Amino acid sequence: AAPSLALVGANSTLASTLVNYSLRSQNGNNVDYVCTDPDSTLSAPGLINAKFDIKAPGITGNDRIHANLRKVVLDEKTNLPSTGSVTIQVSIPRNPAWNASMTVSLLKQAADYLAGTSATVSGQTDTSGFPAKWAGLMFP
Amino acid sequence: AAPSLALVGANSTLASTLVNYSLRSQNGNNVDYVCTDPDSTLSAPGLINAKFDIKAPGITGNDRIHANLRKVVLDEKTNLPSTGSVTIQVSIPRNPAWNASMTVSLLKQAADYLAGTSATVSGQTDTSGFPAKWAGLMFP
Amino acid sequence: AAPSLALVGANSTLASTLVNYSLRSQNGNNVDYVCTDPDSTLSAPGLINAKFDIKAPGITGNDRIHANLRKVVLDEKTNLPSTGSVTIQVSIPRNPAWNASMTVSLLKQAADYLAGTSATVSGQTDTSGFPAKWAGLMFP
Amino acid sequence: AAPSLALVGANSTLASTLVNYSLRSQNGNNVDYVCTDPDSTLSAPGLINAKFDIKAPGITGNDRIHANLRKVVLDEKTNLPSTGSVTIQVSIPRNPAWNASMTVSLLKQAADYLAGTSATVSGQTDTSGFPAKWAGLMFP
Amino acid sequence: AAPSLALVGANSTLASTLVNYSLRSQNGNNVDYVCTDPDSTLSAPGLINAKFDIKAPGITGNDRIHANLRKVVLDEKTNLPSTGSVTIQVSIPRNPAWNASMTVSLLKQAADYLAGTSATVSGQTDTSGFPAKWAGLMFP
Amino acid sequence: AAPSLALVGANSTLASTLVNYSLRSQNGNNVDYVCTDPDSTLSAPGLINAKFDIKAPGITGNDRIHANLRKVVLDEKTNLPSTGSVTIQVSIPRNPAWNASMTVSLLKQAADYLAGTSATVSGQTDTSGFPAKWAGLMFP
Numbered sequence: 068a069a070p071s072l073a074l075v076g077a078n079s080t081l082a083s084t085l086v087n088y089s090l091r092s093q094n095g096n097n098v099d100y101v102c103t104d105p106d107s108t109l110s111a112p113g114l115i116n117a118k119f120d121i122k123a124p125g126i127t128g129n130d131r132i133h134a135n136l137r138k139v140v141l142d143e144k145t146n147l148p149s150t151g152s153v154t155i156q157v158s159i160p161r162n163p164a165w166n167a168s169m170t171v172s173l174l175k176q177a178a179d180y181l182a183g184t185s186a187t188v189s190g191q192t193d194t195s196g197f198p199a200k201w202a203g204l205m206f207p
Numbered sequence: 208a209a210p211s212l213a214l215v216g217a218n219s220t221l222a223s224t225l226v227n228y229s230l231r232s233q234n235g236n237n238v239d240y241v242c243t244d245p246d247s248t249l250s251a252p253g254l255i256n257a258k259f260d261i262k263a264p265g266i267t268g269n270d271r272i273h274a275n276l277r278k279v280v281l282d283e284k285t286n287l288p289s290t291g292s293v294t295i296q297v298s299i300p301r302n303p304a305w306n307a308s309m310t311v312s313l314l315k316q317a318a319d320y321l322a323g324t325s326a327t328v329s330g331q332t333d334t335s336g337f338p339a340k341w342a343g344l345m346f347p
Numbered sequence: 348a349a350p351s352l353a354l355v356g357a358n359s360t361l362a363s364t365l366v367n368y369s370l371r372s373q374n375g376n377n378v379d380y381v382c383t384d385p386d387s388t389l390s391a392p393g394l395i396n397a398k399f400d401i402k403a404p405g406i407t408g409n410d411r412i413h414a415n416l417r418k419v420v421l422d423e424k425t426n427l428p429s430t431g432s433v434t435i436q437v438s439i440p441r442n443p444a445w446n447a448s449m450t451v452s453l454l455k456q457a458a459d460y461l462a463g464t465s466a467t468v469s470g471q472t473d474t475s476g477f478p479a480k481w482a483g484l485m486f487p
Numbered sequence: 488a489a490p491s492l493a494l495v496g497a498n499s500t501l502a503s504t505l506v507n508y509s510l511r512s513q514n515g516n517n518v519d520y521v522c523t524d525p526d527s528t529l530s531a532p533g534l535i536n537a538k539f540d541i542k543a544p545g546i547t548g549n550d551r552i553h554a555n556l557r558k559v560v561l562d563e564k565t566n567l568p569s570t571g572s573v574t575i576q577v578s579i580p581r582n583p584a585w586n587a588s589m590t591v592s593l594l595k596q597a598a599d600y601l602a603g604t605s606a607t608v609s610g611q612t613d614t615s616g617f618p619a620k621w622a623g624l625m626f627p
Numbered sequence: 628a629a630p631s632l633a634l635v636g637a638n639s640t641l642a643s644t645l646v647n648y649s650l651r652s653q654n655g656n657n658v659d660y661v662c663t664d665p666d667s668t669l670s671a672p673g674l675i676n677a678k679f680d681i682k683a684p685g686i687t688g689n690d691r692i693h694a695n696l697r698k699v700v701l702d703e704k705t706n707l708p709s710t711g712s713v714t715i716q717v718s719i720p721r722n723p724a725w726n727a728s729m730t731v732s733l734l735k736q737a738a739d740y741l742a743g744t745s746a747t748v749s750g751q752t753d754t755s756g757f758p759a760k761w762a763g764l765m766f767p
Numbered sequence: 768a769a770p771s772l773a774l775v776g777a778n779s780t781l782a783s784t785l786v787n788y789s790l791r792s793q794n795g796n797n798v799d800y801v802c803t804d805p806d807s808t809l810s811a812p813g814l815i816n817a818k819f820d821i822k823a824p825g826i827t828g829n830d831r832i833h834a835n836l837r838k839v840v841l842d843e844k845t846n847l848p849s850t851g852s853v854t855i856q857v858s859i860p861r862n863p864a865w866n867a868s869m870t871v872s873l874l875k876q877a878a879d880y881l882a883g884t885s886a887t888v889s890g891q892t893d894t895s896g897f898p899a900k901w902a903g904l905m906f907p
Contacts, residue, residue, distance in 0.1 A: 085328055121344055132344070138309060141304060142302055149301075153296075156295075157321075165291055170338070174342075178318040182324070188223050190213055201272060229625060231623075233653065235374065241623060250441045264710050267707075354599040355605030357592040361591055365608050369906070371904075372654070373654070376626075378626045379656075390686045390721045412621055419684040422582055426686050434575070436573070437572075440569040442563075447501075450571065450618070452497045456506055456556050457573045458602040460492065462597070465503075470505060632892055633891050636873070644872075645890055677906065696877050696880075717881075718850075719851055719904075720840070729840070729851055731898040732777045732784075736853075738877075740774055741834055741855055742871075745775030747783075748784065751773050
């Protein structure tokens with residue numbers, strides 16, 4: 068696994084800003100990253116976690132990927148922690164009628180539809196405001 | 208909800224390709240889209256589902272968003288369907304110490320790390336190959 | 348679904364007249380419209396209903412569409428309501444040997460034979476009087 | 488009944504195409520047509536059925552019309568037949584507060600909403616794509 | 628239902644001020660709106676909800692409308708939420724001895740007596756101060 | 768409580784008309800008014816009721832206002848009475864983070880959205896027809 072990551076997120080103004088993670092450890096079929104920026108501390112950290120559920124060899128099963136991106140925040144009045152999180156589950160069938168291309172296509176479509184980050188293509192719908200609309204709990 | 212969507216995915220070459228969804232049905236705080244390409248048929252469809260678990264206004268908890276992007280595929284030999292899917296759960300806390308900028312930041316970071324579609328920002332890790340590695344059950 | 352509809356029906360003269368519906372509810376792959384015209388009252392309304400029985404993915408079985416177009420009328424003396432209704436069931440198989448084109452062809456033929464509204468084609472039978480004959484319980 | 492019919496349906500392109508039926512049987516207020524085109528074979532035919540449930544004279548009750556438009560298709564491998572069908576039930580009350588005009592109005596509205604074939608009237612909703620959306624199991 | 632609303636309310640000085648709602652979703656016989664102003668957030672939102680309890684066709688029953696306008700507020704000391712709300716229930720009989728005019732008259736009278744917003748008529752009582760007196764828990 | 772009221776309602780034309788109430792009785796935190804027009808008689812009256820659910824000063828909860836505006840109507844054939852009513856419940860929290868300006872704001876918004884009687888403010892939606900639509904069981 069990569070020892071460190073510089074991922075793109077959004078500042079208070081929604082401008083693209085780097086967010087720096089470093090690899091804490093690696094267990095059985097999983098990976099744990101911690102945010103190394105000043106705004107994350109042990110009291111209120113930023114975390115990323117990934118895991119593989121890998122089925123036995125063959126074409127019968129469904130492999131699974133579990134990702135989890137969390138940030139803890141403390142109440143201004145009570146310092147009580149509550150966490151915000153985006154969790155992802157990818158399920159990849161082993162029937163040879165499926166492709167890594169199909170996996171990647173689903174990933175790209177989810178990225179476009181919930182984060183508005185897809186590449187540029189002619190007739191694409193404008194998804195730049197979709198993350199804002201989601202964060203407001205309203206459908207695009 | 209939007210009546211139709213043109214989301215960006217990937218073909219067998221992994222080149223950026225449009226994938227067209229149209230609104231099947233809106234239930235209360237629930238939306239079902241269906242793929243209108245020749246790729247999906249009623250027998251083996253491409254589907255999207257989006258749900259809102261919104262707690263009572265008096266109660267404090269986490270509000271939740273559930274998204275699911277599916278593609279069904281049929282076995283060549285048995286025509287039995289198995290499905291591949293990316294599911295996403297967004298948990299947003301009801302504390303004013305959290306805000307939509309943070310929700311969007313988590314969405315953007317998840318997009319960068321699992322789909323490799325973040326906006327260009329100097330010092331970002333090159334996440335372009337990460338969806339390929341994930342589809343191979345390999346940590347980036 | 349569409350928030351409002353202007354469908355074509357017939358007045359007392361059988362002249363083509365608009366009948367206006369608005370989307371009152373939508374729940375669980377079910378859609379319910381109510382008539383906004385003066386002829387639909389609370390006690391004796393005009394109503395539309397549409398349901399989807401969507402089978403699990405697979406190459407076997409039939410998907411089903413249900414639709415009901417109702418007008419309630421009150422008895423002159425007793426004010427007891429009795430309702431007149433045209434209801435449609437569409438059954439779409441999942442064998443790839445079926446087409447949306449075949450579904451649409453059956454819909455258009457039913458429209459021609461029971462409503463007399465088909466498009467103009469050389470050699471078509473004149474179905475204009477067929478809805479009148481049906482309303483009289485007479486085979487065309 | 489009419490000895491033959493030239494109804495309008497849709498080909499694989501969804502272009503308006505004639506579909507031809509001849510009167511094969513008529514018995515006991517029941518009428519059965521068979522499709523004369525090459526696409527209807529003995530093993531997988533195209534068929535039409537129409538029945539009258541005529542109630543005894545009186546001011547109470549509903550008269551009923553039943554109609555079924557069928558196309559049979561054979562499985563590529565198993566040659567087992569499955570059939571796709573649009574079926575209509577018209578229920579006409581006998582309270583003099585009902586009219587043949589109301590029957591025809593419901594028929595025309597059903598044609599507009601499920602087949603998209605209504606006559607042209609200023610302000611009507613565009614129902615042209617509705618049969619496609621229905622065949623896809625999507626509410627218009 | 629209307630996709631968005633600009634309703635008149637009162638600022639901290641009781642001056643007429645717009646309050647902007649947008650349609651979140653539509654379920655069975657109900658409608659959910661959310662305030663889109665800056666002062667409403669997921670932690671302390673403004674909400675509007677409407678529902679119809681519609682009885683069967685006939686003249687026997689009583690139809691009902693349920694409206695609910697809520698605003699959540701957080702304690703300056705503890706950020707604990709409490710909600711303020713105005714709920715409305717309209718009950719419309721189906722006995723033809725009732726009118727939509729009578730429904731509207733009750734609505735207008737309630738508006739005049741609890742909000743002081745009625746139109747101008749010669750001998751009307753001055754109800755401008757009534758909302759203030761109510762908010763003080765004293766009778767007009 | 769006021770000894771008498773001249774509230775604005777609507778006639779059969781929906782023109783703004785006065786409706787006159789006079790104080791029948793004041794109970795403790797409860798008020799009953801009766802319509803003094805020829806429209807109301809003892810057999811089929813027009814009535815108003817207003818109640819205050821005020822919790823003990825030590826206890827924190829919501830204080831409540833209950834208002835009810837009724838018109839009784841007699842069936843022409845049976846002289847059986849059925850009644851039509853608008854009821855209002857105002858729930859005001861006992862947290863200083865809430866105030867009378869917010870109570871009044873909710874009252875004004877409810878008036879605008881269900882009776883269409885808000886004060887003129889640029890950019891407001893035209894709510895004038897909303898009471899008509901509500902009396903038709905149609906969402907604005």
